[PDB]
Design a protein around this motif. Structure first.
Motif, PDB file in Angstrom:
ATOM      1  N   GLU A   1      23.448  14.288  66.056  1.00 34.19           N
ATOM      2  CA  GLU A   1      24.267  13.498  67.063  1.00 34.19           C
ATOM      3  C   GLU A   1      24.462  11.925  66.704  1.00 34.19           C
ATOM      4  OE1 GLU A   1      23.043  14.218  70.882  1.00 34.19           O
ATOM      5  OE2 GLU A   1      24.325  12.874  71.932  1.00 34.19           O
TER       6      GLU A   1
ATOM      7  N   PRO B   1      38.282  18.159  66.616  1.00 31.36           N
ATOM      8  CA  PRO B   1      38.506  16.821  66.613  1.00 31.36           C
ATOM      9  C   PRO B   1      38.658  16.349  65.228  1.00 31.36           C
ATOM     10  CG  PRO B   1      36.846  17.563  68.168  1.00 31.36           C
ATOM     11  CD  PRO B   1      37.077  18.759  67.309  1.00 31.36           C
TER      12      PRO B   1
ATOM     13  N   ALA C   1      22.456   7.209  81.420  1.00 33.07           N
ATOM     14  CA  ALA C   1      23.196   5.716  81.345  1.00 33.07           C
ATOM     15  C   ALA C   1      24.939   5.955  81.586  1.00 33.07           C
ATOM     16  CB  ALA C   1      22.891   5.236  79.912  1.00 33.07           C
ATOM     17  N   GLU C   2      25.365   6.968  81.165  1.00 38.96           N
ATOM     18  CA  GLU C   2      26.610   7.249  81.426  1.00 38.96           C
ATOM     19  C   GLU C   2      27.158   7.652  82.836  1.00 38.96           C
ATOM     20  OE1 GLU C   2      27.290  10.250  78.813  1.00 38.96           O
ATOM     21  OE2 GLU C   2      26.962   8.899  76.828  1.00 38.96           O
TER      22      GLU C   2
ATOM     23  N   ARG D   1      27.087  12.142  64.292  1.00 35.31           N
ATOM     24  CA  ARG D   1      28.276  12.480  65.097  1.00 35.31           C
ATOM     25  C   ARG D   1      28.816  11.251  65.610  1.00 35.31           C
ATOM     26  NH1 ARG D   1      27.047  16.980  68.716  1.00 35.31           N
ATOM     27  NH2 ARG D   1      25.034  17.067  68.004  1.00 35.31           N
TER      28      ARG D   1
ATOM     29  N   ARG E   1      25.849  17.483  74.146  1.00 31.58           N
ATOM     30  CA  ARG E   1      26.383  16.268  73.891  1.00 31.58           C
ATOM     31  C   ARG E   1      27.626  16.045  72.844  1.00 31.58           C
ATOM     32  NH1 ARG E   1      26.644  13.146  76.301  1.00 31.58           N
ATOM     33  NH2 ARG E   1      26.018  11.417  75.536  1.00 31.58           N
TER      34      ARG E   1
ATOM     35  N   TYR F   1      32.913  22.283  72.864  1.00 34.70           N
ATOM     36  CA  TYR F   1      33.380  21.056  73.502  1.00 34.70           C
ATOM     37  C   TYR F   1      32.511  21.055  74.604  1.00 34.70           C
ATOM     38  CZ  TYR F   1      37.251  21.613  70.599  1.00 34.70           C
ATOM     39  OH  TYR F   1      38.121  21.559  69.371  1.00 34.70           O
TER      40      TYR F   1
ATOM     41  N   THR G   1      24.617  11.587  80.060  1.00 36.60           N
ATOM     42  CA  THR G   1      23.281  11.242  80.181  1.00 36.60           C
ATOM     43  C   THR G   1      23.029  10.264  81.432  1.00 36.60           C
ATOM     44  OG1 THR G   1      23.375   9.299  78.938  1.00 36.60           O
ATOM     45  CG2 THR G   1      23.340  11.346  77.658  1.00 36.60           C
TER      46      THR G   1
ATOM     47  N   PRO H   1      31.489  16.880  71.222  1.00 34.34           N
ATOM     48  CA  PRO H   1      31.775  17.984  70.622  1.00 34.34           C
ATOM     49  C   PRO H   1      30.744  18.161  69.562  1.00 34.34           C
ATOM     50  CG  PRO H   1      33.688  16.725  70.798  1.00 34.34           C
ATOM     51  CD  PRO H   1      32.466  15.829  71.225  1.00 34.34           C
ATOM     52  N   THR H   2      30.485  19.493  69.110  1.00 35.39           N
ATOM     53  CA  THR H   2      29.746  19.946  68.037  1.00 35.39           C
ATOM     54  C   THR H   2      30.063  20.674  67.119  1.00 35.39           C
ATOM     55  OG1 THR H   2      27.566  19.737  69.538  1.00 35.39           O
ATOM     56  CG2 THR H   2      27.118  20.973  67.457  1.00 35.39           C
TER      57      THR H   2
ATOM     58  N   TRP I   1      37.571  13.910  63.563  1.00 39.72           N
ATOM     59  CA  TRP I   1      36.270  13.289  62.914  1.00 39.72           C
ATOM     60  C   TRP I   1      35.360  14.463  62.466  1.00 39.72           C
ATOM     61  CZ3 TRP I   1      37.847  12.552  68.028  1.00 39.72           C
ATOM     62  CH2 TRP I   1      36.954  12.980  69.071  1.00 39.72           C
ATOM     63  N   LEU I   2      35.441  15.487  63.005  1.00 36.70           N
ATOM     64  CA  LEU I   2      34.395  16.793  62.514  1.00 36.70           C
ATOM     65  C   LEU I   2      35.206  18.094  62.309  1.00 36.70           C
ATOM     66  CD1 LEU I   2      34.321  18.543  65.393  1.00 36.70           C
ATOM     67  CD2 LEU I   2      32.475  16.610  66.132  1.00 36.70           C
TER      68      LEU I   2
ATOM     69  N   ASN J   1      30.220   2.993  76.019  1.00 42.27           N
ATOM     70  CA  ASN J   1      29.324   3.952  76.141  1.00 42.27           C
ATOM     71  C   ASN J   1      29.031   4.745  74.932  1.00 42.27           C
ATOM     72  OD1 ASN J   1      29.074   3.790  78.841  1.00 42.27           O
ATOM     73  ND2 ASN J   1      30.351   5.686  79.132  1.00 42.27           N
TER      74      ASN J   1
ATOM     75  N   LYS K   1      26.532   2.312  73.027  1.00 42.59           N
ATOM     76  CA  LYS K   1      25.101   2.164  73.843  1.00 42.59           C
ATOM     77  C   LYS K   1      24.561   3.623  73.428  1.00 42.59           C
ATOM     78  CE  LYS K   1      26.045   1.229  77.877  1.00 42.59           C
ATOM     79  NZ  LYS K   1      26.023   1.580  79.548  1.00 42.59           N
ATOM     80  N   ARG K   2      25.306   4.623  73.411  1.00 41.44           N
ATOM     81  CA  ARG K   2      24.547   5.893  72.922  1.00 41.44           C
ATOM     82  C   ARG K   2      24.037   5.806  71.314  1.00 41.44           C
ATOM     83  NH1 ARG K   2      21.469   9.911  74.316  1.00 41.44           N
ATOM     84  NH2 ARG K   2      22.366  11.942  73.448  1.00 41.44           N
TER      85      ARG K   2
END
Ligand SMILES: [Mg+2]
Ligand SMILES: [Mg+2]
Ligand SMILES: [Mg+2]
Ligand SMILES: [Mg+2]
Ligand SMILES: [Mg+2]
Ligand SMILES: [Mg+2]
Lengths: 47, 250, 105, 110, 97
Positions: free
Chosen positions: E56, E46, B74-75, E59, B112, B67, B72, B114-115, E48-49, E78, E81-82
């Motif tokens: 990414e 989560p 932009a955020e 993702r 970036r 988590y 980045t 959650p992975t 969704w995963l 966001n 845009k990402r």
RNA sequence: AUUAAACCUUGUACCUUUUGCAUAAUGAACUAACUAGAAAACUUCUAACUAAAAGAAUUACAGCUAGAAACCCCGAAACCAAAC
């Protein structure tokens, strides 16, 4: 405030050298120091 | 009365079944009461530690979800207007006060969202890992075969003392056939003890055996494991998900 | 580094070869751990090599003090009073044996 | 009041009269007065093996490890297994009692 | 540089707590349990995963699909845009073509 | 190197950059912290089973499945929308 315990440990020994070397302690006979048995050392002296 | 167990399934003719000393936890000195014959293809497979490594890493990674997250450029709040004109001021050219080169800016290549690290090994591969782990404990005299988990008293002290007397390791893993039928006396004792961890038969895993020094298996659980794993070989490839009705599958 | 370091002239301790050659190495001390992968190589050295080395050099008092430890350490004491310590962390028996023979000479 | 018996040693030295014990044990187990070629007799029967190996363990005090149980195909294998000694002395214990030269001294901190 | 002038507190880990002791149990629930449940169903994470992995950009799109309609306005902006940044990177940039 | 800090001998700052040359031309007063390579179509390597492999839909005239292994940073003049 970085992570880890090791970086402090290496520096603690660096502090050790600074204090000991700047203000050395009075000499102590080798008997008081570790790894001393009288009889064994006497034997080696003759050998 | 020697308690004798023999393989219910057919062993290959060339292979000779392995044997184990059946034990009873009821008494301190009841070290040996019966003899068992363990299927060679389960308890005598070739020693390969890469499969144990493969499954052990699997039992670590597929569950893993991280988590950690970093914004980045932009955020990051602000950084819309250009700080100053390109020329005339004697400073380098920047287009936002929130850039990777700026204090308070957004991270360049950070974590970036959650992975997920989800992957599954083939069904046979993970089943093979269980077979390998079973032999390793047996050969190293870490596996003890017991008829039943019944104990004289629920006191945890008795179980810990018994392990030292019988030379078992500090950490002991106890496997019973089913969760519902497990004796109450063992339930009280094992719960109070951290090292002695009790699991059901279906919950056997490679990682648990590696963490635990010795493993205590009940006789019915051995038969349960023997059938499940040996089914994995001599089977077809699934036409369906297995849970759906099959001609010869429970 | 030559201008950045000290220097001396060739010298001996007490005219070692004029009369009788006296062994300069005085004492070797090795600390080991019963259960530690890093000190495994040193544990082999004590099992086999240490006994042979002790007899071969009878003027070197050898102290072995197995203790709960993280790095095995060898401390060499010479007759002139100089001390020398070398880290033996995760070194095989072959490396230690060669290393110790340098200290004695 | 279950009292744990004192812990037993895990070192075994072969008795000189081991042969007498084994031959007597075989006679008692099956009662054939030790037929010639007794060693060659196999332990395939489950009951036979259990009675023999268990009885020897009670008297001698050492039992066949589960890992080595399968390889005890014949009485000869069982006889050989008991003959080899078992030592609990650590390799360090040998060094301590090896009578090393005076210049070598060892101190145990554990 | 500068280093700590005191040793940090010792960190003690109890390796026989309930979570660590029973870690891994029921990972073979399927093969040993007549394939009633796939092990992926035991993952906590989560929505969704769970039982899924992707890069990414994948993702990002997958997070939108499951909870695109339940997201806050700024978070959704966001994310959009990402996605558009990643799309132009993975589909128009990089050393290899 | 030296008995000796300096004298004696040898020696055209660094990076980027130009052709593979600089006495050029860019950039740096110094310290601390921060500050830029990321994806698996094809290939290689490692295993599981094998005319079959895959935990449903996929591929196959030795294949199939899983693992590991990859592709940066900063900077315009501008353009459009809506407020002020
Ligand atoms: Mg912005
Ligand atoms: Mg603007
Ligand atoms: Mg810009
Ligand atoms: Mg920030
Ligand atoms: Mg400048
Ligand atoms: Mg750019």
């Amino acid at each position: 405030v970085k992570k880890g315990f090791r970086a402090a440990f290496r520096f603690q020994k660096e502090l050790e050298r600074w204090r000991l070397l700047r203000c050395p302690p009075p000499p102590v006979r080798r008997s008081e120091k570790p790894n001393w048995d009288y009889h064994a050392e006497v034997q080696a002296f003759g050998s | 009365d020697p308690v004798l167990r023999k393989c219910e399934l057919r062993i290959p003719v060339h292979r000779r079944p392995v044997q184990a000393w059946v034990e009873s936890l009821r008494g301190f000195e009841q070290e040996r009461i019966g003899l068992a014959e363990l299927h060679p293809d389960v308890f005598a497979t070739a020693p390969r530690l890469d499969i144990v490594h493969q499954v052990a890493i699997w039992q670590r990674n597929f569950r893993r979800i991280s988590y950690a997250n970093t914004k980045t450029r932009a955020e990051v709040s602000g950084g819309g207007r250009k700080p100053w004109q390109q020329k005339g001021s004697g400073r380098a050219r920047h287009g936002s006060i929130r850039s990777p080169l700026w204090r308070g800016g957004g991270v360049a290549h950070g974590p970036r969202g959650p992975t997920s690290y989800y992957y599954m090994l083939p069904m046979k591969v993970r089943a093979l890992g269980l077979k390998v782990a079973l032999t390793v404990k047996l050969m190293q005299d870490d596996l003890h075969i017991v008829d039943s988990l019944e104990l004289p008293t629920a006191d945890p002290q008795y179980l810990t003392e018994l392990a030292q007397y019988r030379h078992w390791g500090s950490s002991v893993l106890l496997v019973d056939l089913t969760h519902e039928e497990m004796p109450k006396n063992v339930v009280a004792a094992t719960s109070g003890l951290n090292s002695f961890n009790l699991i059901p038969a279906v919950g056997l895993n490679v990682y648990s055996m590696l963490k635990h020094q010795t493993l205590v298996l009940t006789l019915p659980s051995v038969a349960f494991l023997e059938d499940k794993l040996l089914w994995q070989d001599s089977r077809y490839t699934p036409l369906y998900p297995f849970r759906l009705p099959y001609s010869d599958f429970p | 580094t030559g201008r950045g370091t000290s220097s001396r002239f060739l010298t001996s301790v007490l005219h070692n070869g004029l009369g009788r050659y006296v062994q300069q190495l005085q004492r070797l001390s090795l600390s080991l751990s019963r259960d530690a992968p890093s000190s495994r190589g040193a544990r082999e050295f004590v099992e086999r090599e240490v006994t042979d080395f002790a007899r071969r050099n009878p003027g070197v008092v050898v102290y072995v003090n197995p203790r709960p430890c993280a790095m095995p350490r060898i401390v060499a004491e010479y007759l002139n009073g100089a001390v020398r310590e070398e880290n033996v962390n995760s070194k095989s028996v072959e490396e230690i044996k060669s290393l110790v023979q340098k200290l004695a000479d | 009041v279950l009292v744990c018996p004192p812990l037993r040693s895990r070192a075994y030295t072969p008795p000189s009269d081991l042969q007498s014990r084994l031959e007597s044990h075989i006679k008692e187990v099956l009662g054939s007065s030790l037929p010639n070629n007794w060693q060659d007799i196999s332990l395939d029967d489950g009951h036979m093996k259990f009675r023999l190996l268990a009885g020897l363990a009670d008297g001698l005090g050492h039992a066949v490890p589960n890992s080595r149980l399968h390889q005890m195909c014949r009485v000869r294998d069982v006889l050989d297994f008991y003959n080899v000694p078992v030592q609990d002395k650590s390799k360090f214990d040998e060094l301590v009692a090896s009578n090393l030269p005076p210049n070598l001294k060892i101190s145990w901190s554990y | 540089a500068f280093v700590r002038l005191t040793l940090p507190p010792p960190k003690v880990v109890d390796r026989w707590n309930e979570k660590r002791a029973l870690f891994g149990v029921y990972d073979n629930i399927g093969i040993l349990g007549n394939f009633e449940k796939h092990p992926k169903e035991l993952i906590k994470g989560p929505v969704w995963l769970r039982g899924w992995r992707g890069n990414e950009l994948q993702r990002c799109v997958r997070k939108k699909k499951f909870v695109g309609n339940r997201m806050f306005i700024e978070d959704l902006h966001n994310l959009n845009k990402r996605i558009s940044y990643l799309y132009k990177h993975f589909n128009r940039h990089g050393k290899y073509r």
